Design a protein around this ligand. Structure first.
Ligand SMILES: OC[C@H]1CNC[C@@H](O)[C@@H]1O[C@@H]1O[C@H](CO)[C@@H](O)[C@H](O)[C@H]1O
Ligand SMILES: OC[C@H]1CNC[C@@H](O)[C@@H]1O[C@@H]1O[C@H](CO)[C@@H](O)[C@H](O)[C@H]1O
Ligand SMILES: *[C@@H]1O[C@H](CO)[C@@H](O)[C@H](O)[C@H]1NC(C)=O
Ligand SMILES: [Ca+2]
Ligand SMILES: [Ca+2]
Length: 360
């Protein structure tokens, strides 16, 4: 039942175009240019981070996959898409604040966005589609109820999550709900409360067939499995994603949710990282491209290692005067100067390339 089995993963043209139009013209070294071109072919998730992406980038990518598959691709290609446009998005940090606000028609806007995505996916029932649903949202509901914007958004996040899970429960779709990372929900105190929250949402959505499990480490830098805990992980015993998942799955399973996992490794190649504290998430120094996307995980509970966050796309601006400035992005272990979240950050791309493991 692994939705990553029996397909290959399509590398999308948005990221390929970033690398060829924004990155490569800035690289002169012949070997580095060639390595950059190779990264552009690694199949990372495409993000529906703005409403305008639905009718443009989603439809174009599904059209291109259809065309490649009709031309005889073997194995057939599958799409990898992130749904990331909740109103009052990114409730615990300014950096990825979205286009919609709950107080300004955000619920209606989001339900329409989900409905349009559904319409598109139904029309592309010939393209196997793997979705990650709303990075950070439910993890914020576990740990950030002390933050007024998160507390105020919780009931809306819950309603809209259940809406998405039901609406996008289509026969050719597999969904993974975002579930934080080892250094967030994997702390032993947070992990049972997290299991309870995720299992109840699953139950309240009616246990949709298409919900395959959870995504972890999205846009973070954790190791899958290292023998020695990186110093910044102390004193969390769940110091890597393998520890987190092996602790988390039994808890979820006892509560009726036999979740399979995908694990982001797109910025996990260099361990330990240059994070001075584990909570430093923004444009972290000392990181590299990590293990390539694969279903060959060597672990029963892990469907795939994936590249969810596309390395080179910024985590947040370092401009202290900007509306979306988060103090995390101005720290000494954040690469600077950095552009707005989601925009291309070429010096970061080069860092990831230099530190890539396996190398390009
Ligand atoms: O309060 C949120 C913290 C808790 N500690 C872990 C830290 O990662 C988390 O911050 C979020 O980190 C994710 C990436 O893992 C970011 O995408 C969020 O923007 C940030 O709030
Ligand atoms: O992980 C979700 C957000 C919030 N914090 C980490 C950061 O990297 C991420 O930003 C989003 O990244 C995606 C993929 O690059 C972009 O589409 C978004 O514009 C951006 O906000
Ligand atoms: C979102 O995009 C759709 C087309 O996909 C459009 O009809 C709708 O008006 C847009 N939503 C908002 C709130 O602008
Ligand atoms: Ca397997
Ligand atoms: Ca290696």
């Amino acid at each position: 039942g692994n939705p990553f089995e029996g397909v290959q993963l399509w590398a999308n043209n948005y990221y390929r175009s970033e690398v060829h139009t924004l990155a490569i013209p800035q690289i002169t070294d012949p070997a580095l240019r060639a390595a950059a071109s190779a990264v552009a072919e690694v199949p990372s998730f495409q993000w529906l981070d703005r409403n305008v992406t639905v009718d443009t980038l989603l439809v174009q990518t599904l059209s291109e996959i259809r065309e490649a598959n009709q031309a005889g691709a073997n194995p057939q290609y599958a799409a990898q898409i992130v749904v990331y446009d909740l109103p009052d998005r990114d409730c615990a940090a300014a950096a990825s604040n979205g286009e919609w606000a709950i107080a300004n028609n955000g619920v209606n806007n989001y339900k329409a966005y989900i409905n349009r995505i559904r319409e598109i996916l139904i029309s592309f029932s010939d393209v196997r589609t793997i979705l990650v649903i709303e990075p950070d949202s439910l993890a914020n509901m576990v740990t950030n109820m002390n933050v007024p914007k998160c507390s105020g958004a919780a009931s809306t996040y819950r309603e809209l999550t259940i809406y998405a899970l039901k609406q996008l429960d289509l026969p050719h779709v597999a969904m993974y709900m975002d579930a934080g990372h080892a250094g967030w929900l994997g702390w032993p105190a947070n992990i049972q409360p997290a299991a309870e929250l995720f299992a109840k949402i699953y139950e309240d959505a009616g246990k949709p067939r298409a919900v395959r499990g959870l995504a972890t480490n999205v846009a973070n830098y954790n190791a899958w499995s290292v023998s020695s805990p990186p110093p910044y992980t102390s004193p969390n015993p769940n110091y890597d994603e393998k520890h987190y998942i092996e602790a988390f799955r039994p808890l979820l399973e006892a509560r009726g949710f036999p979740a399979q996992f995908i694990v982001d490794q797109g910025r996990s190649g260099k361990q330990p990282t240059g994070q001075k504290e584990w909570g430093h998430w923004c444009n972290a120094i000392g990181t590299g491209f990590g293990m390539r996307p694969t279903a060959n995980t060597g672990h029963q509970y892990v469907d795939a290692f994936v590249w969810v966050k596309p390395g080179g796309e910024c985590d947040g601006t370092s401009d202290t005067t900007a509306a979306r400035y988060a103090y995390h992005c101005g720290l000494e272990d954040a690469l600077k100067p950095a552009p707005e979240a989601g925009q291309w950050f070429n010096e970061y791309f080069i860092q990831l390339l230099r530190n890539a493991n396996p190398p390009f």
